[model samples]
Target: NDLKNVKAIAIVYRELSDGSQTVLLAKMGWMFVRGHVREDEEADPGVAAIRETQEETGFTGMVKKSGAPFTQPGRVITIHPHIVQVQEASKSKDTEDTVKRQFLWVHPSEVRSKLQRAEMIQAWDQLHSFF
Candidate 1:
């Protein structure tokens, strides 16, 4: 089935007590906390998205905000995670290289500019309506 070829993506955002807002983005030429849904996780792409986010960003304390479902090359849904970092320590070991990957937090103002791909921008625009 074409639907079997799915990829899960995560858009992690955080709002500070002082009201600053930032979005987590992976700098692989520009993308999100994303990965292909494993065979076991295909039934729940949302679960896969969280795992992908943690693996890529080493972030914990993530709470699901909303899910944007849409059709693409295959069935894809982007999970919006609003994280509250009560603990600054990473869940993944620093030596794993996962922690060393290029991930950056961009303010909401610059998020649109940072995203270079058309599909990413479209996905973000759809996800934006959820906020």
Candidate 2:
């Protein structure tokens, strides 16, 4: 049932001329860039991932990484992501703005320890080979 309540997740990245790649992670309670799917983007999570990453990070041209079953000219093929449940919360005026959080582009090795959640670490380990 994890997919039923699924919000989109993104492990955005860019390749440098030196053949090295860097991954983007958001500081949202310390997780990868993630957001709930929009009604119009329900048919494809990649769209949701891309859209959310763009809105939340203001980064552009973040095409999906290679190796995904589907490619959208513009996307993470690191290990498949673990579905982490979001705790329910009532709407409040204090709801944080996502872009206000710290965003970092770090090496793949740094991510293993930087991630706070066990599920996120597991997902990164699966993605370990790709980086």
Candidate 3:
């Protein structure tokens, strides 16, 4: 049931280098969107976030579980956010599920300019308003 509707989360991580941080973004592949929850799989949003990130990027690292809760836009869509600290390119490995994944070490002053999606920009704004 690829299209049957399921819950999923996207774990966004930033790579750190030279005292700077870089954000990771993935492009949609043959599939319009990736990451879906399998049937009988039970996990909290935090765990789901990490799992999805690994499945999508094959990157293994520590993710700072966010206090934010899952946000649902409509009847069958939900997203959870998590932050991870990435230190090296060698640490990244793309999973079979990944079509094309790349790391962009970005500056906070340049994040808004680098992000292409309006929704993503909005999410970033909402997530880091206090910062």
lDDT of 1: 0.60
Q: Can you list the residue pairs that collide in candidate 3?
A: 22-105, 22-106
Deviation from native of the Cα of residue 32 in model 1, angstroms: 1.3
Q: Which candidate order results from sorting by TM-score in descending order?
A: 1, 2, 3
Q: What tens digits encode model 3's per-residue C-alpha lDDT throughout 1-131?
A: 33234444343556445655555655651110135555544355445555566666666555564534344554645444445553333333445445555555445555566666534554566554322
> How close is every model to the real structure, measured as TM-score?
0.71, 0.64, 0.59
User: Which of the two, 2 or 3, has more TM-score?
Assistant: 2
**TM-score of model 3 (CA atoms):** 0.59
Q: Please, what are the lDDT tens digits per residue for candidate 2 over residues 52-109?
A: 5556655544334422322112232222242221222324333435447787778877
lDDT of 1 by residue, 1-108 (tens): 223556666777776779677777777567766666777765666666666666676665454543545555435543332222222445556425665557677876
Model 2 clashing residue pairs (backbone): 63-74, 63-75, 64-74, 64-75, 65-75, 79-127
Which residue pairs in candidate 1 collide?
Answer: none
lDDT of 1 at 11: 70
Clashes of each: 0, 6, 2
Regions more than 4 Å wrong, model 2:
1-4, 62-98
